[PDB]
Design a protein around this ligand. Structure first.
Ligand SMILES: [Ba+2]
Lengths: 196, 196, 196, 196
């Protein structure tokens, strides 16, 4: 077994790195099953020449809404769960990671099917926050996924390969995704159906 | 659909901004229903020429009290829930936001009606904390709402409009509020009544 | 009603302050009832000439212990709950505050009576952490309470008084405490007794 | 009773310290019972000549996996619970500490027995994060434990001794461990067995 991180803390990625260049999120996001739960996932990249300490990820849902009392909220924000409750939003970014938001009863996508999706008017803001080790300072990097940019029933291509006691990232594959069998029911719908 | 945040992370607000000037909270706060829950809301502004990273909001209730054992606490503090449990207190401040505190059993306003309000001796301290991107440093901004400054049964006027592929903020409307039909019972009272 | 914090964020404490000097905890800590719950409380002071942003408080229990399997832990640490779950450990330090730890089933003092106390071999480490506004940097301040320094059945004297539209702190009273009727049973004991 | 931390905040460790040198984790990690729960523990050292403020610890499990739907995740990460929920991951590092992760239903080691262990292909990444008081800046220190480096049924040797009103650390013992009677069943197995 070849290690990912060595005893002294130095990682075994990007052979001959030196741990501005900017961080990248995948251009699209995907939705598909993982151990029987429907998930939304987007890929967040790393920085080729330094770690990001106290790194964390969050997401906001931007969607205008009307409260049952007629109050209309343009571009309302609501937090999307991507690990906050278990500290899985506290990232160890040393290679591109697939962030996953399980679509459960408390997710805003709970009632959105595949057909329902391209009709909805919404945007997901993805915000990475950490301290650039080398730089000393607090960075923030943002990106955005609009409806048309969320691909139902796809999955992210892997980019990680072990080569000669070092792990290397084929950054070409970063944004690439492939298709997989995926039900077109809504999370909610899937849940009711399984519940009988 | 015109985006709020572009793929590269640059927002589409305040056409031709350059992302000291000071942040502003609304002068008053309002109380009114949102999807059948009574809420207290105050508006928190943004900074016209920079983001605030790791931005977060909290509120303290200042009200002198007497413990059942006679211990009198002058200006006692207790935390007001404004998203802490779900990370909705972690703000993405790129335009004035309405912060909302749902008045539930664990809120201090649970037993305060409309008539009861102007009688109570209390103050809400609102504290924004984040890192000014441009400046590098940790800022804090504070404000305060006393009883007379909490308007029962009102709502905040919207200030957000889409113009020419950019969203613009009519800062005149920032502090302005309007009236809406709102029961004058206390949260607690409303709850009991609905519970039968 | 005279405000504690003004609309522009400036507080109304310490008339003519300018918002190194060091922060002070009370020399002793006290234990006594608050709304029918037994509490341990110590007082944490403020800094006369600046705020402390992102201020937070925590406490550690240092007590050597033996695991049921004979493993002996010298000076074992375990966290004492002082608001962590509700964000009441996130302080708004603009005048000396009484920090309170409710002694419940999950507290380490759950089974410690008044008589039992002076026999136990333990220490409470109190750690304040925040960013000194003026200084720019992250401070930490520590103190410690050993058994003999925890006064059962006392309460903290108030130090806060309103004078001429400003609130002033009689720093003489800071460490002073007085006595109050307080049962000498353990929290656990009190609980069982009330439970019948 | 000789104190660990003095009233003024100065600790009573490392007689004549001055509160780069690098922090050290133990070379191995151990698994063994503590009050009837099976735990995984590794030791994290302190820094001989300065405190680490806002110090915190986290751990990641790196293990490649296949989702029930065939999606294969190379070097998947998942957070290991080491105090996050109760703030026991917020460390008071003034002498080497044994960090403990209780192996419960939500731990990834729930179904891993002693025999099962050396077969599994996994790695634990341990990440300390804090602010070096003297330095002003945010540090991160990392280490790693692979299967062969996790010793089933051992415990950490104590290194802490009281000498002349000061506590001293025999840094020789730091990495040393000894054996203890320890069941070779999996946590899960132990649980089922006790549940009847
Ligand atoms: Ba920080």
């Amino acid at each position: 077994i070849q290690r990912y991180v060595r005893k002294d803390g130095k990682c075994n990625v990007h052979h001959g790195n030196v741990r501005a260049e900017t961080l990248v999120f995948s251009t699209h996001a995907v939705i598909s099953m993982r151990d029987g739960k429907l998930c939304l996932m987007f890929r967040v990249g790393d920085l080729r020449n330094s770690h990001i300490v106290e790194a964390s990820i969050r997401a906001k849902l931007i969607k205008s809404k009307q409260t049952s009392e007629g109050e209309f909220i343009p571009l309302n924000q609501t937090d999307i769960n991507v690990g906050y409750y278990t500290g899985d939003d506290r990232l160890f970014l040393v290679s591109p990671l697939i962030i996953s938001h399980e679509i459960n009863q408390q997710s805003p996508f709970w009632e959105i099917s595949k057909a329902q999706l391209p009709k909805e008017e919404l945007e997901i803001v993805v915000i990475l926050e950490g301290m650039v080790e080398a730089t000393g300072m607090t960075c923030q990097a943002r990106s955005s996924y609009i409806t048309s940019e969320i691909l139902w029933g796809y999955r992210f291509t892997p980019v990680l390969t072990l080569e000669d006691g070092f792990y290397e990232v084929d950054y070409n594959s970063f944004h690439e995704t492939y298709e997989t069998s995926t039900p077109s029911l809504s999370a909610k719908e899937l849940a009711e159906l399984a519940n009988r």
